[PDB]
Amino acid sequence: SHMNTNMVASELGVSAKTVQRWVKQLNLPAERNELGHYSFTAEDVKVLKSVKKQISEGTAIQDIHLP
Secondary structure (H helix, E strand, O other), X not given: OOEEXXXXXXXXXXXXXXXXXXXXXXXXXXEEOOOOOEEEOHHHHHHHXXXXXXXXXXXXXXXXXXX
């Protein structure tokens, strides 16, 4: 009912491994879909877009602010 890692990566314009790096580094919650794969919601996409935006602006991973 939601979006897997490939879908998220597609909407962000990054690779799937990049999404996985951020999710784990930033201790972000991730569910599992009907196949047991990682799954994300629209909220997650927005949060990960904020991560990408902040890194792009020069913010270090540890200085990132998340809701």
